[PDB]
Amino acid sequence: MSYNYVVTAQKPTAVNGCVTGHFTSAEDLNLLIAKNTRLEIYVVTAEGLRPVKEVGMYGKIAVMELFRPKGESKDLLFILTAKYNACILEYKQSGESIDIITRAHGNVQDRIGRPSETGIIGIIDPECRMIGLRLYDGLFKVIPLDRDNKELKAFNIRLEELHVIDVKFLYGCQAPTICFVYQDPQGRHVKTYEVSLREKEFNKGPWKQENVEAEASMVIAVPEPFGGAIIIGQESITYHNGDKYLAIAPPIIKQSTIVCHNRVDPNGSRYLLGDMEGRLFMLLLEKEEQMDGTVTLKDLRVELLGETSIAECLTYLDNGVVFVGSRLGDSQLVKLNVDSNEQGSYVVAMETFTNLGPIVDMCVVDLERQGQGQLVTCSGAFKEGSLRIIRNGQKLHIRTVPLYESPRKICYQEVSQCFGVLSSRIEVQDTSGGTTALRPSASTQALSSSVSSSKLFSSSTAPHETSFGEEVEVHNLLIIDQHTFEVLHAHQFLQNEYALSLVSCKLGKDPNTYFIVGTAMVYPEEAEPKQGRIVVFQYSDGKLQTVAEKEVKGAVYSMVEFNGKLLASINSTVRLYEWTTEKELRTECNHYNNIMALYLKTKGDFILVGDLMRSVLLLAYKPMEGNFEEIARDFNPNWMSAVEILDDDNFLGAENAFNLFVCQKDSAATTDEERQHLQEVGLFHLGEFVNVFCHGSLVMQNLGETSTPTQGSVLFGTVNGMIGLVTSLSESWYNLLLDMQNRLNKVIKSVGKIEHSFWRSFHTERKTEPATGFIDGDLIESFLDISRPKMQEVVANLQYDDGSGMKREATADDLIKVVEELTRIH
Amino acid sequence: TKPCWYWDKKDLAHTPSQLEGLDPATEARYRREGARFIFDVGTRLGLHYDTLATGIIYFHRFYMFHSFKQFPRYVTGACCLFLAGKVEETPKKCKDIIKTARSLLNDVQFGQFGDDPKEEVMVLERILLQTIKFDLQVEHPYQFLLKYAKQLKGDKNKIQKLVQMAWTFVNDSLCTTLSLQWEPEIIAVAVMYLAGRLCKFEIQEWTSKPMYRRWWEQFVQDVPVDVLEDICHQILDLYSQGKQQMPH
Amino acid sequence: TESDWGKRCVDKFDIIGIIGEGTYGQVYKAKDKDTGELVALKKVRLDNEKEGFPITAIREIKILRQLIHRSVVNMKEIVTDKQDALDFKKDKGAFYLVFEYMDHDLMGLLESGLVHFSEDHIKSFMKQLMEGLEYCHKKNFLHRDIKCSNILLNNSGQIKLADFGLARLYNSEESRPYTNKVITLWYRPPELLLGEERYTPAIDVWSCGCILGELFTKKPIFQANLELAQLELISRLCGSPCPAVWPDVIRLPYFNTMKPKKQYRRRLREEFSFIPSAALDLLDHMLTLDPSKRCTAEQTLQSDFLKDVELSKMAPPDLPHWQD
Ligand SMILES: Cn1cc(-n2cnc3c(NCc4nc5ccccc5[nH]4)nc(N4CCOCC4)nc32)cn1
């Protein structure tokens, strides 16, 4: 068996959702911001936000909404986790003591169901009579909000329309009514139903179905003054309400897909719209009052306000202030002005909240020769792309290097006092027949530049037609100084060439230190690329020189230096090249039994291979023979995101289902076969998507640091900006910390009353397993924050083992010291 | 796909046993003894008639590729029966076969099994499997005797007399190389034909085509009387050579 | 020749790796030195010699040589380890079973979740599967181990069943005692849970019905660790075993012993409303509690869902791609 320890060094920073309301008091204006597994509660002021409370939940927050049922003084909070844990929460404050009340809770997962493509949707009735949930295709789940439903029991109504895009409850209806856009073979259509809690079924809805834009994406429930709904698409915005129908199709929105909406004026007169290029719009509902005294919708107008960060959620707060919640970049507070500035913008940034964004790749480098190690991460996407330099000093110090283009891979080349970074920028087919970039960025603002002139694929004769306006990716190798972080050089790769891998190393007997990039020719026609290049560069005297190129028949997904040789993964093959005295790459040996060799890692003459469906396969290079040998394979099938080698026997993996697992050699050499079974001894549900695993530590090492119980240090980066550390334990230390977890879970009150053991249980859609071999460091490190009575309650009847004293009782003060040492590992 | 398991009579002059100096009579006697050994052991163990025959068929085929001077018959027979049990899902433990073989064999005969009988037998399973080319499925005249008899309609007692007499002829042909010369379907017809002659029964009348004097041609296509007579001659020879007479 | 078996040595095939864990032994992959063909090999260990050659292997070596079907795995030949010359007693070498290698396995295609199954894919997959089963059932053989791992799919969309090791012959005119609980519990029929021991061919039908729904839900229908807990889940969906729906349930050994919490009603159509109508009818018939009322393989092939499927179009599923 294996024993390991997981700690969160930096919490998730990406904003996954945000709502406003009256949650902490019926009087204050609140802003609730949701980051993965984290809820932040703020109070809105005239200058900005006052933080008041932050809680963790044992689950990914999928639905977050505020509502106020008749009889309550203030808003209640509904949250549903991605594992279908539902709860209703209440804020309660007793002077200085702030706590969160679980008013109702339960798990709403159906034994039989098909998860929907557009994900979990949750909405609440304007009369707060019920909560609607769209969890599965063909089914609508209703939780009625009666006082007695403390377990959140619910029923399903059969839904004929199997593929639903979005749904909302409507305002101004005699009964609870849903308005939704759905897709069938005849296109996309909008439709309504009424929800009867008494009959537990749908009844005919208030207004008819109409054919709507093929890419209709979002549904807006317009408030009582207008009523009805607005449907947002790629080219058009439409208003629907019985007999009334409007459509505005302004050319400005066709340029970039709109992804978020919020209401500015409670009466529905004004809405905010955002798009994937960061533009912020105002949608205006022009009113016309008839002599009847009735108010109708005359027209719709769209006005461009300015640019924000690409935003997952928008929420207008008050006055001119808007909160911009960003998942791909830094979040913001911005002020909307009535008068435009001299550039034509009505939007002016107030504050910037750090978001490590998607961490595509990262490396650890000791820039200042301190013995510490700082983390340089490839963070953000598109305009928000950045390099982030992170050091410990009690908070983390983060520096931001704007790139304005998507960062892909990073590697440090000390000999050149610089980094190599792979980047991609979006250009659009223009009238010249070439392409034009939407904005300047790192690869265009380099001091010196070069473009690959390889003719290897130039024989072409394969047609790829271009239409004006289509997007294309331009990949470039950036040379960036380690002190100024200035782009010294940019190398632009061939047209339709994607860079997938990057290493910095010496090879063979060649004293020169090279940048080596593995690329793949990507054409929309190909399900999988069949052409690729390996390019060897030398950065010397401010210029990047192409040293050699090797054509491959596939995609160079990953590369790694192997004892003076170059180990590369091309499609279904893993290859080892030698670097000749003629400065060319030569095939030495191959391994072929992989579906897609996506990730690679080396220790000694051993190699770990990560496949799309075949999990992890342990290879070894056999020098006496000059070839590879299969050592062992994990027979449980998994979809890999990144792998790492912990030691000569233990191997770490990351699944696409937000799960972490550890494989080991079966350590029983009875039969050759037994060792060949890489047995998963560790299973853990991280709840975050790991892209990169990297050895190192950010803790300052003065050489005086007490040797911690934990041994080893693997840092990992995730999509939501969470950074974690995995380390190993002895059997004794595991058992102590494991037994303590079970004791802490009985003591610590969970938000929503979510069982911790369920939260960390391995979870794929098909299978679910209890966690094993892993210690939730955050649960252990929360011992220091629980009140003294609870601390002593935890240590009752707690015995140590395998120590200086075989059985040794624990006191509250003994454990406080142990955990405090464990907080120094990160 | 499937191997050919049938030879011509002329070919039996050239079995390994023949070419190592064994004369035709001795190999013939050696085959009867082994087949009857397989028959007697399994009957003592209570084995189904198909299981006995399958062992016997393996046995006969085996000594088409090997010599009786290098492979003692009784070990082979036991091995054939042992495997036949597992193939026909009437399994028996090897130790029980050895026990029964010892009861029926005198001391000289059981000397073939050597010091460790179980081990000498187990070593032969490997060769047997390779020799039979892993062709485990075997069809036997018994199933055809019954499939064809079911289609005869007439005096219930005369047909049952025909079946039992033919059934006995099948059991007796397992001591001969007919299993190696003709498919089981022909054997079933030949024994019906033989019993018909001996009981003075005209089988065509029982068939659906009573005026079709070659009654068998509706069961087995392309069989000349030449073949059925050759089979009958070979069957009655065993009776004339021995002291036993036709069952009637 | 092609008919000569047991003589060719394993030297001719070079071992690449170990593809997976099987029913009774781990499976490997190789290429012939003479032919580039990739194959699949299972090691038969005769070293125990408690009773010679394994009887279960003898079962697989008998049935497969008889079964010929596009949707049934073919055993190409049997090979051996190096044998000592003139030393038959000393020889301890083992035999291997040569099989056609398949590009993908349903267990790894579904577990990863990358694959996407449209209705038309499920149709082509089910039609081939049931046609193979109908072939084997028409030949009066019972598989008894229908599982995702034994289901294999080529990239082209051709499917074949694989490990026939646990399979045994079924006698219709006369019942015989068997080995009771056989199929993986997730896909085991209620009759085996209650110990019918003399199981009918419908045990395989129930399994394939569990597979059918699994394709639509992208999740196994019945997941448990305890036979009673499984019976609870089966009862919650297909209805609890009761004399009205299963007249002969009272004759089953554990009918009184093993009981669900409640007498649940059948909600199969309700819970599976999303499944298309043509398929839902197939599931209701395949997942019928009474083995006597449960549909046959032929009846599944003469269903609206599968009758009009043309095997010329094999609809390969969305096997993984590069942006994927
Ligand atoms: C008679 N018979 C035939 C077979 N057989 C033929 N091909 C296969 C086969 N290929 C799928 C596959 N595995 C891979 C491993 C690494 C890389 C690529 C892979 N592709 N998988 C399996 N299994 C064994 C149990 O685990 C999964 C299913 N069994 C097969 C077994 N018995």
Residue numbers in the entry:
A (entry chain G): 1 to 393, 708 to 1140
B (entry chain I): 20 to 267
C (entry chain H): 715 to 1038
Sentences from the paper on this structure:
Recently, several unexpectedly diverse compounds were reported to deplete cyclin K by linking CDK12–cyclin K to the DDB1–CUL4–RBX1 E3 ligase. Here, to investigate how chemically dissimilar small molecules trigger cyclin K degradation, we evaluated 91 candidate degraders in structural, biophysical and cellular studies and reveal all compounds acquire glue activity via simultaneous CDK12 binding and engagement of DDB1 interfacial residues, in particular Arg928. Crystallographic dissection of 28 ternary complexes demonstrated that despite considerable diversity of the molecular glues, the overall complex architecture is highly similar. The low-affinity DDB1–CDK12 interaction primes the complex, while the ligand, through filling the kinase pocket and bridging over to DDB1, drives robust association, offering a rationale for the unusually broad chemical diversity observed.
To further explore the contributions of SR-4835 structural features to its activity, we evaluated various derivatives. At R1, an unsubstituted benzimidazole gluing moiety (DS55, (61)) showed a similar binding mode and only slightly impaired recruitment (EC50 = 36 ± 2 nM), while exchanging the benzimidazole for an indole (DS56, (62)) largely abolished activity (EC50 = 2114 ± 252 nM), highlighting the importance of the two hydrogen-bonding interactions provided by the imidazole moiety of SR-4835.
